[PDB]
Design a protein around this ligand. Structure first.
Ligand SMILES: [Mg+2]
Lengths: 377, 377, 377
């Protein structure tokens, strides 16, 4: 059976009988008729709804944490994948792989109707990137989020605030290793590592970048992938955050992201070399410093450079201290937040130090990234 | 009549005659054929266009203010609601309820083809949240926006700049009580109130939060809903804004949002206890301080904490003044903007004071929230 | 042939045979049936996918620069235009007009299946705004982007980083004359001009706005389109950026956008009056100062006001120096970035000067705009 049809031009002056259907041969679609409206009512090609992703509540993430190792996709979620509609009319359990402390996972909605997580961010095992659509993810943390203001524990579990989907996520290109702070913005769970080019800025159990162990030079600003910065100046850490679509925190962001840590407490000992791990000679375990949002080593471990200036100024004369990129005049200090291991009761979620100019590079200053919260219709 | 059909796999090697239609039984959709293309041309299921919202001009809000108490939805607006297409081919009047000074309203497009406003943000009277879709809203202000730089009047009316829709709105979760400043960002119409947890940050005729009447403690940062902060330090006001997905203004934002106020003028008297209402012993009525964008008490009433640091510094020694969350060193002042009631000709849209550290808490400092402008395709 | 049909209510209790199609006369759409599901499966009206724009990689712009004067639209791009689906299954060449140095172009996908650029931002020649859909654009620069840290050349060509589309673009209303810096945010290619109301903030070969040649007064803040500001104070430049949905850069943004310029080098001579053109008596041609991202006169030409405060403070007393909009107390300096023509080896991508209060207005300070990167699903 071949239906009556014609071009779009031929349809423009044609009024079909009520409930008559024709085919527009220019568009390769069906046109429904009502006995009254010239041109009828063309229907949409599936191609024009490719990547559709519809949630019942667009103001919240698409998933719910249901236990330390379990999560569900929410009722009312509709997903286009591989030419098909896949929907969930009730909260539906996500099939989990083996979960390993300090690892990010991607959540996929597949064309067989299943929803599943995997450590692989291209495709889950058993599927391809065609039959399985990445719609979100989460961080399986090495310990709990802070229930109050005494840090968390060392029981590996899903961080509820690290749940993201394609329309509810970090603005930064790579959403991995980040957590949503009070619903307002995203923070890196871990302090910046030396090998951030391959690891991203936020990775568990890696060597922390600071004034002595400088980060690798950004490949967007002349770096070759191997060379590190000559030192850990503010300029270099800011440049690295920019590379990854992030920034250093301001004071309002820092107090928010670090809330839940054990206040007026520092790591002790002589160093904090590694993310998510006890410091060298530490008197407090790493988990003492976990925030409400699951930010790890949120205070009392390393200072983070901030994206704010103020406090004491440098000399009122042109000073070439920017790594060969011009001079500064009356340069104010760049903020440092959080305290570090040797600062005893001065560390905390509002600890702030404004004496150090941006060219300074001591062993107890590193960085933590933040970015905007991206919500989409 | 049952059409020829089969699975998606069976369709992959099938080329129907030109204008033949088949049914894909995996997808439950129609496939159109052209006599040439194997697989044909699948059509889209309605489920995959749920929540569609299309405007002729996505760079502007979907509505036009047509009078003090009237507004229309713009021509070319197409809305999916309850499985149906509802569109407007000309500017179409919004059915209004009784309008009450200092109240927010939601605009709904309903499946019977009507567009209507209501004080209820779940559903308009006569409808449910299924048959009526919330697409936007506005603030019915207690007075006019400033036509020049002498404030506004006390004639209750729709604030044109407070019009928002789901793809043209404050980035903050709750869009109510906000206005778009020069098309650039949104500002709270009213100064922060004590009861912001229930009222939101921007509400007419409520008790203003300041250094003596501290805001309720944020429930995202340890608050129980009843307890207030011990004082009105910068830290506490910043924390409240974060709770609501907002922030304190910087200097560029403040001069923009306050433009239109009566410059070099203060409220006078001894206090400004309440939003949108005359101050205690005031020599100027509240409306003298309305900005071009309808920001109420924009200057000369209470200072707002700003999200900027600079000016005079605190001691260059560790000082525990953050409410038990660590120490500050060489802490710069946090900006204050706008002036307050006792500052005579020093108040204005560019009034700025940089002597007060963030731990200060006097009766003449409160806060105003701002957030980004969210525009979506 | 008229198909069986009825209202949506009549459909609710109707289960058609498998592969039966009916027409919902309320919706004017087709409903597919499966012999089991009451109500069947309504299909989507084309109206509900109007403006659909789907890319294979939503994290990147839709176009690729293939030469100095050529570009293609990427494979997998699907576009709704004039009721039709237009797609590209391979990278497809964009038809170019004559290209003129320092000019912005719009890219259109047309309903005849072609993709083409034009200097006109309403419609390309030969088409209307109905048959041709603006989907993006680019800047044809007067010289190359910096390949290293020695600026660029004077060979006119497409700036790859200036490529934008409707879902990958400056957050500012007008995307023209901007470039994406390290994938993080957008910067104005050119310094702010006097005639920014008609030209936008970023235009080639126009008179630069500075402390002597003040910008035209913003028409959103009392300007009439002809009057200029009394001087070039920080306040005025910030106000102009706000008008255009932009802001002055902070330090982290500035070092990023200016990277690639010839460091520790200034224009020389006595002035830099014009964008994209040699300075008056310059010892370095304009192209010496082109950044990696194609930011023109990025350093060593004019200082830009920054959106940051710090450094040396003004008197600790109320000072009416805001153009009649209140007084400032202990006002910190507003940052200046980049250096200017007379600053020899002190200029560069990290050059910063913090001695000048915002009310200052010398001939060697202007402004450059930045804004957020807008990525959409
Ligand atoms: Mg500052």
């Amino acid at each position: 059976v071949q239906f009556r049809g014609g071009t779009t031009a031929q349809h423009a002056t044609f009024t079909g009988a009520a409930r008559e259907i024709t085919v527009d041969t220019d568009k390769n679609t069906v046109v429904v008729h009502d006995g009254a409206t010239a041109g009828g009512f063309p229907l949409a090609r599936h191609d024009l709804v490719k990547t559709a992703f519809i949630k019942a509540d667009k103001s919240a993430v698409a998933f719910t944490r249901t236990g330390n190792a379990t999560a569900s996709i929410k009722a009312g979620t509709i997903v286009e994948v591989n030419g098909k509609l896949v929907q969930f009319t009730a909260d539906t359990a996500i099939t989990m792989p083996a979960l390993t402390a300090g690892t990010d996972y991607a959540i996929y909605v597949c064309d067989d109707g299943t929803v599943r997580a995997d450590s692989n961010f291209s495709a889950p095992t058993g599927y391809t990137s065609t039959t399985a659509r990445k719609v979100g993810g989460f961080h399986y943390a090495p310990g709990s989020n802070a229930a109050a203001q005494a840090g968390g524990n060392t029981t590996a579990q899903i961080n509820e605030y690290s749940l993201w989907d394609i329309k509810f996520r970090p603005a930064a290109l790579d959403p991995r290793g980040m957590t949503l702070v009070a619903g307002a913005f995203w923070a890196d769970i871990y302090l910046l590592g030396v090998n951030h080019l391959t690891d991203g800025t936020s990775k568990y159990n890696v060597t922390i970048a600071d004034g002595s162990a400088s980060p690798k030079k950004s490949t967007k600003f002349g770096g070759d992938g191997s060379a590190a910065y000559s030192d850990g100046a503010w300029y270099n850490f800011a440049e690295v955050m920019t590379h990854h679509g992030k920034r250093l925190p301001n004071y309002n962001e820092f107090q928010a992201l670090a809330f839940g840590t054990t206040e007026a407490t520092s790591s002790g000992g002589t160093d904090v070399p590694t993310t998510g791990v006890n410091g060298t000679g530490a008197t407090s375990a790493w988990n003492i410093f976990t925030s409400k949002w699951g930010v790890v080593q949120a205070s009392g471990c390393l200072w983070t450079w901030g994206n704010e200036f103020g406090g004491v100024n440098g000399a009122s004369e042109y000073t070439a201290n920017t790594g060969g990129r011009g001079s500064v005049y009356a340069q104010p200090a760049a903020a440092l937040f959080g305290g570090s291991w040797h600062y005893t009761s001065n560390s905390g979620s509002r600890a702030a130090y404004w004496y150090s100019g941006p060219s300074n590079s001591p062993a107890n200053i590193g960085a933590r990234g933040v970015c905007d919260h991206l919500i989409l219709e």
